[PDB]
């Protein structure tokens, strides 16, 4: 029922919201994400040089 088309004609709007958050300051650390981690089950590890 289009009656006014000013403020209340189409109720249930999205409030001008988007589904993506913007971190204004860069806080990523590609170093660790690049260096892959390896699993160890035991606790008697040993490496050679």
């Amino acid at each position: 029922n289009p009656t006014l088309f000013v403020s209340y004609d189409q109720n249930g709007k999205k409030l001008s919201f988007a589904n993506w958050i913007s971190v204004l300051s860069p806080q990523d650390t590609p170093f660790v994400s690049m260096t892959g981690k390896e699993s160890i089950n035991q606790t008697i590890f040993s490496w050679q040089t």
Binding site: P2, T3, F5, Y8, D9, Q10, N11
Partner: protein, 50 residues
């Protein structure tokens, strides 16, 4: 409008001598018609909200 009244007495003496009848014909009533609009005026930006 109506019918002719009774006029009460209705005696007669063998002769009418009327005035071409007392018909008093019907009355014409009339009536007029009007308009009803109820305008509506909406904006274009208010026709796309939720």
């Amino acid at each position: 409008d109506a019918l002719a009244s009774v006029d009460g007495n209705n005696a007669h003496v063998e002769g009418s001598r009327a005035e071409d009848g007392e018909m008093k014909p019907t009355v014409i009533k009339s009536n007029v018609t009007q308009i009803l609009r109820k305008v509506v005026r909406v904006s274009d930006t208010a026709n796309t909200t939720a």
